[PDB]
């Protein structure tokens, strides 16, 4: 008896599940994935050997910062977009928190000036946007003409000649450019008339109206669609040219077609390189690469190989197709080392000289190399098909964290997504479209807020706790509708397009064997409602 | 020469393949599945250990029984449904196998009496349904007003306060309720006027017209859409509160965030629990759980660990999230035990005391735990996407037997499929739609019978020997059509929407390597028919 009371009480404990607002990616960050390849046959390759490897790639040293965009929307009917001039940004937006009702635009190649409801030039205060996230803040004058101001993420990568905005647009000027001595030599594609730098600038929040306590240097630039501004800072000091990307526990090397070919079970890729080592020591002044390669190789050897294998010699270095560098240390198993010892009684130099020993090894290791290659093609084929069906799930599973993703052709675009606490989400009582009697929503409508005191935002329940801003998933209202949707650890049950109750995850049967089901399943018999 | 004669002769031996009628699930049985989770990083977790585990879950002891539904269909044009009163069930249906032509219904909130073809009240005989399965047998008076009687499966689970019908409808009354001394205390939500119990009831089959040789107690209940009746029997005696769900061959336990986290390669669920054991012996009177936990742990240890590991101590017990209880016995491998021996000379209590030994173990086992977690997320991601494309195949593969399945939102509904012998199936000579010349059926039309002398039922050939009752898969007729469909341990070939012949599975080429195909494939050349 009593045990059921304890179980009933424990069944109240819900998982720490949360909702996520995953906005659509703009293409500011795209990532590739591997394609299945023509796998080689076992007779191919020579001089097979096993060893430890450490793969490095070009260190691009990303520099993330925040930029503010300012622009005017114009509708006259005839839709247009225009940048805010520096004088309006400094003397009205930053100084007072207002924009001019006037907006210059172009129609039939001639300049024209628009106004709010054809009224005279007047100052208008900006109000924070309703749907905007706590991080990606924004403000606007309305809700004709409308003044808009938005704070967005920006990224620049080595050599820092350009930066990309969270909107997917590029700016062909260095984030470090400026009139300051060490900065007037940085890259810029724009005429001097399109750029302005303000020393001793003091910001003013469009929300709290609080003016900044300390001065900064602000850069401003006029693009034909909007003006961009960001806080200038001196360039970051230099760093190592390559970064340690992967530490492989085991890696087979073989000569094939006059080039080395590297492969392992873990790494889905295979590296092709020349038979000549790269002269790393001449360029790696200070041992950025040497120190890490030696440390990682010894650590991996100690962790496993120490009791069963022997090192052939000192680590080697090779450059492969793409941006990669491979540090490598070939190994010999104790059982194989004994063969070289006995054949010597008739030491790196011996390895590929004993044709009778190597003939066995070429087949013995070739067996493994081909097995891994055929298996990786099978996994890639399945994973690449699933990626097209649900890029959000495959991207999140690949990365190990929730991310938003789009398929953007043959390359995947990705973005971070915002978590929302489960107590800030409310589910609406009906799934029917009030204005279109024959149509119903396919998934539940919801109302939520990013923060405990924020305004309620209308959305729709996506898959696996995702919250969508667009109430656009629709269906014809078919009869006999019953559905269970995932909602904050538990489920939410809808019957005939009407909300009824919430279930805990323990209220639904979990399957494992036919024995579990033979005692529960029934021969279902449809009732065909009128 | 002669070998081909033997091969040709053996090629006649077809497999023991069968057809299956998979009716659509009604939602009377729904099952959940795992969702990929946040995989922890190797630096997390402490006090890692390996051990044997036995997982138990709450025993709901399902009680399956047979119930009969009685109702009247009314069409006046204006469609309605009504229950058959007890007097009609006892005095006409069971007594004589007939229903009244009359039926009470409600229109515009007023009671009205319908009549079959506007004729006077008269008795109508019940005739067996054409399409009904041997198990879900049923009868009706026609083929206005129509009397219907159907025998369906019903299920009740602990505490047995309600039951669900194969139609997906619930009945808020205990199957054990009745006027008897030990039964009038059971649960019921309905007024006394809606229930009737008949002692000394003698059933009469609506088919054979034979009256039963022994008396029974029959319960009858009037729901606003049908009356339900079932044979009453005294409540089943009590059973153990938990059932042994899983025997886990190897289970890693680790402390993380002030809670134990369990994981294995096989069990896709990572159980979470408090650091304190449960007082099982205080509630497990008669050792329902203890006896099985001890027996299983010893059996699994003897089967493998017997010669390579040492038991730390007596089995422990922990209650986890959801309805689970975990019995656990931590182990130490012989090689690890020696490390504790050599440090002690300077027993269970020692395990987490030698910091330098545990630091090595935390990394060693942490490596494995993270590897399993990342692997399981990859498998779940692929399996969950495939489930949406073909729930019948994935439910059947998960269960290990043919089942009918439907996606019902974010939870899968399931039911049993009815097997049909291959000699009882016939394929129709054409797949063109006679009444709609521009359209053709997507898959072959068929005729079959569940039993060797039963009437022929018209249907359509589904995927992998499934037989569908609705001829609804359609396409526009296109020139150059050629198709091979799976049909009873072989194939059936259709050309230009017409049936031609049957093939054995041996008449088609099986692929294994490119060598098999390089000698067979051609550079196909399209002939573009007129």
């Amino acid at each position: 008896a009593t045990l059921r009371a304890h179980l009933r009480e424990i069944k109240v404990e819900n998982a720490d599940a949360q909702f996520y607002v995953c906005p659509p990616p703009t293409g500011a960050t795209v990532v590739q994935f591997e394609q299945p390849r023509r796998c080689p046959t076992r007779p191919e390759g020579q001089n097979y050997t096993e060893g430890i490897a450490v793969v490095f790639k070009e260190n691009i040293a990303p520099y993330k910062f925040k930029a503010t965009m300012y622009y005017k929307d114009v509708t006259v009917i005839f839709e247009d977009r225009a940048p805010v001039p520096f004088e309006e940004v400094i003397d009205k937006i930053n100084a007072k928190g207002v924009c001019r009702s006037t907006a210059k635009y172009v129609r039939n190649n001639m300049e024209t000036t628009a106004f709010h409801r054809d009224d005279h030039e007047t100052d208008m205060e900006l109000k924070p946007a309703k749907v905007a996230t706590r991080t990606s803040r924004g403000w606007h004058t309305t809700d004709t003409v409308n003044c808009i101001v938005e704070e967005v993420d920006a990224r620049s990568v080595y050599p820092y000649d350009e930066f990309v905005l969270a909107t997917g647009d590029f700016v062909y000027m260095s984030p470090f450019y400026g009139y300051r001595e060490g900065s007037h030599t940085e890259h810029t594609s724009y005429a001097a008339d399109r750029f302005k730098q303000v020393d001793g600038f003091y910001a003013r929040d469009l929300t709290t109206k609080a003016r900044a306590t300390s001065p900064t240097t602000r850069n401003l630039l006029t693009t034909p669609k909007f003006t961009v501004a960001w806080d200038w800072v001196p360039k970051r000091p230099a760093v190592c040219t390559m970064t340690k990307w992967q530490e492989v526990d085991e890696m087979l090397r073989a000569e094939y077609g006059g080039s080395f070919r590297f492969s392992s079970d873990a790494i889905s890729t295979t590296f092709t390189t020349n038979l000549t080592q790269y002269s790393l020591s001449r360029v790696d002044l200070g041992d950025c690469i040497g120190r890490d390669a030696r440390e990682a190789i010894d650590r991996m050897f100690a962790r496993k190989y120490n009791a069963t294998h022997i090192k052939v010699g000192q680590p080697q270095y090779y450059l492969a197709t793409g941006g990669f560098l491979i540090a490598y240390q070939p190994l010999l198993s104790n059982t194989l080392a004994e063969l070289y010892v006995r054949e010597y009684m008739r030491f790196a130099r011996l390895q590929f000289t004993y044709n009778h020993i190597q003939r066995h090894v070429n087949d013995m290791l070739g067996r493994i190399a081909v097995a891994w290659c055929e298996l990786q093609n099978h996994e890639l084929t399945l994973w690449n098909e699933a990626r097209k069906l649900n890029p959000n799930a495959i991207a999140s599973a690949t990365v190990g964290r929730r991310v938003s993703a789009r398929m953007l052709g043959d390359v995947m675009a990705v973005s971070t997504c915002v978590p929302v606490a489960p107590d800030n989400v409310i589910v609406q009582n009906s799934m029917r479209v009030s204005s279109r009697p024959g149509t119903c929503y396919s998934r539940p409508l919801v109302s939520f807020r990013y923060e405990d005191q924020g305004p309620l935002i209308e959305g729709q329940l996506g898959e696996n706790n995702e919250l969508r801003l667009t109430r656009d998933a629709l269906e014809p209202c078919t009869v006999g509708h019953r559905r269970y949707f995932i909602f904050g650890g538990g489920y939410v049950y809808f019957e005939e397009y009407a909300y009824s109750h919430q279930l805990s995850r323990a209220d639904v049967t979990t399957v494992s064997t036919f024995i579990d089901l033979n005692i529960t399943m029934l021969e279902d018999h449809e009732f065909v409602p009128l | 020469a002669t070998l081909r004669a033997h091969l040709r002769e053996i090629k006649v031996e077809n497999a023991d393949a069968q057809f299956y009628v998979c009716p659509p699930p009604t939602g009377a049985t729904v099952v959940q599945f795992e969702q990929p989770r946040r995989c922890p990083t190797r630096p997390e977790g402490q006090n890692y250990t390996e051990g044997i585990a036995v997982v138990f879950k709450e025993n709901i002891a399902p009680y399956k029984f047979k119930a009969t539904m009685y109702y009247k269909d009314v069409t006046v044009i204006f469609e309605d449904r009504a229950p058959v009163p007890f007097e009609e069930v006892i005095d006409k249906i069971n007594a004589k196998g007939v229903c009244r032509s009359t039926a009470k219904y409600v229109r515009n909130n007023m009671e009205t009496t319908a009549f079959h073809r506007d004729d006077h009240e008269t008795d109508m005989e019940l005739k067996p349904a054409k399409v009904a399965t041997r198990t879900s047998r049923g009868w009706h008076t026609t083929d206005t007003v129509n009397c219907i009687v159907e025998e369906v499966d019903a299920r009740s689970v602990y505490p047995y306060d309600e039951f669900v019908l194969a139609t997906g409808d619930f009945v808020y009354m205990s199957p054990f309720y009745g006027y008897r001394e030990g039964s009038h205390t059971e649960h019921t939500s309905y007024a006394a006027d809606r229930f009737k119990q008949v002692d000394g009831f003698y059933a009469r089959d609506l088919t054979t017209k034979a009256r039963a040789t022994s008396p029974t107690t029959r319960n009858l209940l009037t729901t606003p859409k049908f009356t339900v009746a079932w044979d009453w029997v005294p409540k089943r005696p009590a059973v153990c509160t938990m059932t042994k769900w899983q025997e886990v061959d190897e289970m890693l336990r680790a402390e993380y965030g002030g809670s134990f986290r369990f994981s294995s390669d096989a069990i896709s669920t990572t159980f979470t629990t408090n650091l304190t054991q449960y007082s099982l012996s205080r509630v497990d009177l008669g050792d329902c759980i203890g006896r099985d936990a001890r027996e299983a742990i010893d059996r699994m240890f003897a089967r493998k660990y017997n010669a390579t590991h040492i038991k730390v101590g007596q089995p422990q017990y922990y209650l986890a999230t959801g309805g689970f209880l975990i019995a656990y016995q931590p182990l130490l491998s012989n090689t690890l035990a020696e490390l504790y021996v050599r440090e002690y000379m300077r027993f269970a209590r020692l395990q987490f005391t030698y910091n330098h030994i545990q630091r090595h173990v935390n990394d060693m086992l942490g490596r494995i735990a993270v590897a399993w977690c990342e692997l399981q997320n990859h498998e779940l991601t692929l399996w969950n996407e495939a489930r949406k494309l073909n729930p019948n195949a994935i439910a059947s593969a998960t269960v290990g037997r043919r089942v009918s399945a439907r996606m019902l939102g974010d939870v899968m509904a399931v039911s049993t499929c009815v097997p049909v012998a291959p000699d009882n199936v016939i394929v129709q000579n054409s797949m063109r739609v006679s009444s709609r010349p521009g359209t053709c059926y997507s898959r072959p039309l068929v005729s079959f019978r569940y039993e060797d002398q039963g009437p022929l039922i018209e249907g359509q050939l589904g995927e992998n020997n499934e037989l569908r009752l609705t001829r609804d898969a359609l396409e526009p007729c296109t020139v150059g059509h050629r198709r091979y469909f799976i049909f009873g341990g072989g194939y059936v070939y259709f050309e230009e929407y017409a049936y031609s012949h049957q093939l054995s599975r041996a008449d088609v080429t099986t692929v294994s390597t490119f060598i098999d195909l390089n000698i067979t494939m051609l550079e196909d050349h399209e002939f573009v028919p007129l």
Partner: nanobody
Amino acid sequence: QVQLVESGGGSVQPGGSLRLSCAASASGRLSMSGALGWYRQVQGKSRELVATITDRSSTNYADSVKGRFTISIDDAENTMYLQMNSLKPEDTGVYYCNARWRGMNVWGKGTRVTV
């Protein structure tokens, strides 16, 4: 999880009237419940059926109560009420609200009524 907060109990002389109420948390919508109702305990008996709504439009009452009491619901407030008119001394006991959705079941902490 669903919570049923019950209120409206007390004491009145014979021939008086009362109104019990049972409000539910957002996690369980009463208008969609498969069976809603009030059950009474008496010193020498188990839970008697008092009044229920066994389908979204059906109704049930005890023989000894039919005509005096009335059950109703409010979908906006997510609350159900039991209007009790012309009480008798026999109506004394502990009343418990119950609501159940497709196999999930919930009981309120019973309120006392005495005459």
